[PDB]
Symmetry: none
Subunit: 162 residues, 8 copies
């Protein structure tokens, strides 16, 4: 049933903090001015785009380094600022004309539980709370910021071509 | 025991270095210009505010990044500078008309010991020195900056509602 | 958090193989752990029903002797049998495992436990991973965490 | 910090299960006795250092305790911890700061919170471990008591 | 890892430090029952089992259906004739070891596995490192990984 | 044979991210403006040069802090934004054979060069496909002082 | 005789990289512009100052953030940019009118070995190479960025009285 | 310089209890690690003299049968160390010690190849150039022997 969920995947939505990051927030005088990412996740992102999967971002936080990083990777569909994830998710569905089953989500915190409950490919990072790991169909062995996304890309590569 | 200690709680005091941070100090040419926090602690902070638990900070180190983070999280009760912890503790008590039993302290270093010996809910981070740990009613599973504050918020949430 | 799930807990299922046992057969002078016997007593005194879904049809005698209720030897269909017999929800059930065939039942229950040296696949489905390896007294550790929480 | 606690130490209370053993029982179709040789050396080492030795365990153990009594351990309590602690404390007229405790049980936690030198075994549940000032490298039954004896001696 | 496991048709292993912790109880033999269950799963899966060792566990192993048993050498020359024998490529074979003598053979095979407490030299040449220490059921672990990553 | 491979070595090529770094990318509004290195690797760089090994860099990523660090250590052959193409240009410039060159990698896009090269090195964290082509794998994960460890190895075998 | 060595201690010298820092180096366009310390080490220094022990630093590397931190800490003798440690060790020893037995040294590097062989209180950090740990009289539990100097300060305070 | 330390090594000294055993005594049977036996054979084949310092009867017989004759019992290890050093005419750098105990530390400080076992007290792990992955009597001696052999060339 995992392979089926994966073979049908058309759009992968990502959380940022705790997923592409280790959860640390780098602050100077004017807010979150630095964000630390992982190099392997960047190769994973490009691998996912090469295979025809649209990548979306829903992050409760906004950041100039994040936007810069996302734009550099050619990411698309960016929602920052709002923790209203389910309402944003439904905007993504509507504009891409997609079903729940052809969408994925990689989450970390309680905020993402209700999106992952509808989504066909719900993914929890290793360091995610018990509450999102129970709702996940795949749990990464790598923590957020350690190449967790590269891992999901490689699972997707195998199962799509299997 | 523990359930009742936490039901009496209306205010939580916290240190920064070693509690909201891992204890590292990021120096630029002009001093401590960068300060690194944990995204889990920001969620736990707002959860405690929502539950009716006022947050206070007593810390000898002040930082522009610290000020920006705390303001963003709505932590308005902030005492920085070279103060004896007990002096500030009594300013807070007087201001909010609170007893020892209505207050919590999450500490780290020996400078916190006498206040922790007075409060209804004294908490220590896992990395806190044993002198602080012995005076604590609850010791966190997580080190400072790993998400110890969310742990204390979750524990308080469970204990109050049961 | 652990405390929410331990609070609903009424029924705990286990594996034996790699959980109550390290797997070692001594030859037959083979024998087992006393901490787990004291953990079993503690769970039965706490009003928690004990069950076992083992892959190997073996030492059910030690379990019978310690007072273990449900015994299945030689899986989702079996788990569903226990759920209806005791009229419980998923949230009220726990499962201590170390096997990949345990994973799907572990995803369902409210208190899934993995032993320390279980495969990562099993460990990431668990709410609690034990500090003991299984055979080393994992069941005592679980019962004592339940009592504490 | 650790050297300050060790300095005041005059009595070390210990558990049996999970500290002196790994919990395993061995049966010949009879019982194979298991005692760690390093723990006996640890016991003699602690005695030579003037540290009184005591045992508080819920479970009685006939094969150990026989060994411990042979090795010279006399303060033995089997079968309500923190009632028994107060008895040994008063009997030897000591302060909390002067007692150490080696535990592998949640029933030890309240006693370990009081004592000057609380010790937890490596694979003990985190609840126990976070209350101890020292956590051993060795498991129960692999020579944990000897490691505690080694440490006290090094810190003096 | 999911790729390597699909091609797998033969799995070679050490005995000592892998199926055992190396302990000798003195006329007492210790064998891990979990490893017996792992052997049968591998056999159900169509994977041929072999050992290259450099001894009392042999009679139980043969009884459990283990074919190629080589004992007392110290491993590339023996690996090479296992390969010739079954007409297999490197990518179709796996190896479970804990000794530096296994390294050269592990470098060739498609699925090299090291046990938890193996020398770092052995572990760095492994595609997978077991959570079990050996004598704890590390062969059950490898069997169940292959199954999981397959189906 | 490793002693023999080491004895031929005259030029070592390096990847950066996952080799001299732990994979982390530090970003501000204007991109990767902060880059974190290890003091041990700096010692390793110098130690390798004192043994007469030319050092070269072929990285896919470009960064100001990277070139600052690389120039500071006296690394001359720097190639950013890029691998087999660049590999031949270096081989040609220094009139070397495949057997006289080394490569320390982490990523899959290093394999191609690592199969040609005489001293292919994988860092501990390196992907399995990379680790399998390597004749030496470091204990250090990269950012942990992997280059110092490569220097010690070469020093001993020479 | 660890008590004996510490009782003679009047001055304590220390490396930076791998002792006050985890050996990591934060680079920007203009070199090492960020440096990470540990807060526990701050309390360690104030404790040694209270004790009346003079603090020296000898570091191979130099950075703007390094100086700023050491100046804020009130560190008396700051040598930076030099790898000739015996030479400046002899400068510090002369300046303070002291014997080898009155000086301590916490090292990480092989360059420290020769100065540590002279000093009365030679200290290695946990992560230090065997060549250095071998010469030391105390090896710390904590690594470089983890409060290794706090550990040494508390140790000194315990052995002193 | 770990490969430097191994290269000079001519004599390896060890404890028995905690290094060749977990310390457990089975009472009414003896426990030896067979990998340590092979480890012993490899060390011998590489011209490394094996010595033991202990403070015991069951395992000594086995060691004697495998080729270990430099055996010390009933010990305070510095003075017997100087003896082995004198007897074999070696410097500190040519000797190795695999330790488990705080008593070993002074000797380990001096020797060229100090080894600690995985579960040794940290004080003993502090003074080792190598910490083994095996605990106890898991095959720790063999692990040291493999390492010396690998690090040769």
């Amino acid at each position: 049933a995992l392979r089926d969920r994966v073979k049908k995947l058309k759009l992968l939505i990502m959380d940022i903090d705790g997923v592409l990051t280790d959860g640390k927030l780098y602050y100077t005088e004017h807010g979150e001015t630095i964000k630390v990412f992982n190099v392997l996740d960047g190769i994973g992102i490009k691998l996912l785009q090469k295979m025809g999967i649209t990548l979306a971002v829903i992050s409760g936080r906004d950041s100039a380094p994040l936007i810069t990083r996302l734009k550099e990777l050619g990411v698309e569909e960016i929602y920052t600022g709002s923790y209203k994830k389910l309402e944003i998710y439904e905007k993504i569905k509507e504009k891409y004309s997609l079903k729940d089953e052809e969408i994925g989500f990689i989450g970390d915190d309680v905020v993402d539980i209700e999106v992952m409950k509808k989504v066909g490919f719900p993914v929890a990072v290793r360091n995610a709370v018990e509450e999102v790991r129970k709702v996940a169909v795949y749990i990464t062995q790598r923590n957020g910021g350690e190449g967790a996304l590269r891992e999901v890309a490689e699972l997707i590569h195998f199962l799509k071509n299997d």
